[PDB]
Each structure stands twice: as C-alpha cells, then as structure tokens.
Amino acid sequence: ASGVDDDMACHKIPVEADFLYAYSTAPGYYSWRNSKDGSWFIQSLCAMLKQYADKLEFMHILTRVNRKVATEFESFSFDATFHAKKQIPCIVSMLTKELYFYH
C-alpha cells in the first residue's frame, strides 16, 4: 500500500514525544500531603522505586504507586468537607519505549 502520510524520506518524531508526566492526582482534583510524613504520592513513589526500580519497567512501577495511594490512604480532617477523602495518581505517558532504570 501507499499513502501521503507515511514512510517519509526524512525521519522525524513529534517534539512532544518522549515525555512522561507522573501527576500525584487526577485532573481537576486536590492532592493530599501529610504535614508530618510528606505527600501520599511522593511517599509512595519513593517506596515503589526503592523496591522495584531494579525489577520492573517504569509504567509498572507507577501502576504500583497508583494502587498504593488509592488503597492505603484516606484523609483525616476536622472539617467534614475535607474528611475521609481519597486520591488516585495520574500517569500521563507520551513515551515511545519501555523504560528500565537498570541495564
């Protein structure tokens, strides 16, 4: 087959390619931080990297972070409006290959 938008003579990639945004929370949502232990997201991200960086591909590590934050944390507040709330991190990948911190 042949077309007007494929197999260019000069190879190019999108200027937005190869970016990965690891957001602590879903679009439009607040993000939680424990004034003593640190943010739920960073706490979890570091714990998962420490345990899996030499074993799993980055997206899989971030997925474990999503599960950890989603299941293990719930806000406590004297203000009913902000009490018993949850959080889910948001992985935004424009990566074009798998990423392993080891080789």
Binding site: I13, P14, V15, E16, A17, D18, F19, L20, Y21, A22, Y23, S24, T25, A26, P27, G28, Y29, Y30, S31, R33, N34, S35, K36, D37, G38, S39, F41, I42, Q43, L45, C46, L49, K50, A53, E57, E74, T81, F82, A84, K85, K86, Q87, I88, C90, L95, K97, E98, L99, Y100, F101, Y102, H103
Partner: protein
C-alpha cells in the same frame, strides 16, 4: 550481530542524567499561599531515592516563578549528550496545568517546552520525566467502599 528490537530506551549512557528537585515550602506573604509543611520530607526522600538510581540530584528550595523558569532554561541548555534521561520533580501549590513559584504561578507548559525534542537536542529521543506533587484543581474524591 543478532536480532535487535529497540523496545526499551538506551539507559546505559555514561550518566543516568539529572534529577532536578524544586522544593517550594515557603511562599511570599503577598501571594496568600500557605507553607507546605512536610515537603522537606518529600524532597529528602526523593534525593535519596534517585541518588541510588544513580541520578545527579540537584535540589532547589523556595524558588520564585522567575527562578524556576531561569533554572529550567539553564538546565535545558546544558549538554545532555552523555546522559540517558532527564528528571524534574516539582513540589508546590498548583492548579490544573500550573505550578506555583514562591511569588506566583508558572505554566507547566512553559517549563516543559524548554525540553521539547526540537529545543533540547541532546535529549531528543531520550525520556524526559516530570513528577508533579501539586493540586490540579479543587475537587475531592469521596471514594467507594470495596
């Protein structure tokens, strides 16, 4: 040689790359932004975590919007030829698409644009990771019993 697949990024360059941590804890009174108690714990945890992954960790505390932009521009202008990747961690107040400097907001797009494939050639084809601990709005998730 044998069959080559190229399904994973080349991460065996001489250096893993930089891990820039912007830790904004104290904000100018004029902004009305509260102090972010506990962020130092995050910053320290990140420094140790990425240190063990062999990244060149550089930390910056309480940067103004102008300093954040200057830092990113300067970093994007370095020669990353011998570095496998780039990591930037942002710890601050924020809203959708925005991160706060100590004296005002900064569009995340302005920060990441410095690293576009056409503006930072030594990082073209290499993974650029932005880790963002900041609000993206004011919605709260009530959750659901499982």
């Amino acid at each position: 040689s044998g069959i080559s697949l190229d399904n994973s990024y080349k991460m065996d360059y001489p250096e893993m790359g930089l891990c820039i941590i912007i830790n904004n804890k104290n904000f100018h009174k004029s902004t009305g932004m509260t102090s972010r108690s506990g962020t130092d714990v995050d910053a320290a945890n990140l420094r140790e975590t990425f240190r063990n992954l062999k990244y060149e960790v550089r930390n910056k505390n309480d940067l103004t919007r102008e300093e954040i932009v200057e830092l990113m521009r300067d970093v994007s202008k370095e020669d990353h030829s011998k570095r496998s990747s780039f990591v930037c961690v942002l710890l601050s107040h924020g809203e959708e698409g925005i991160i706060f400097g100590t004296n005002g907001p900064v569009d995340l797009k302005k920060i990441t644009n410095f690293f576009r494939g056409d503006r930072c050639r030594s990082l073209t084809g290499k993974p650029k990771l932005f880790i963002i601990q900041a609000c993206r709005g004011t919605e709260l998730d009530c959750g659901i019993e499982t």
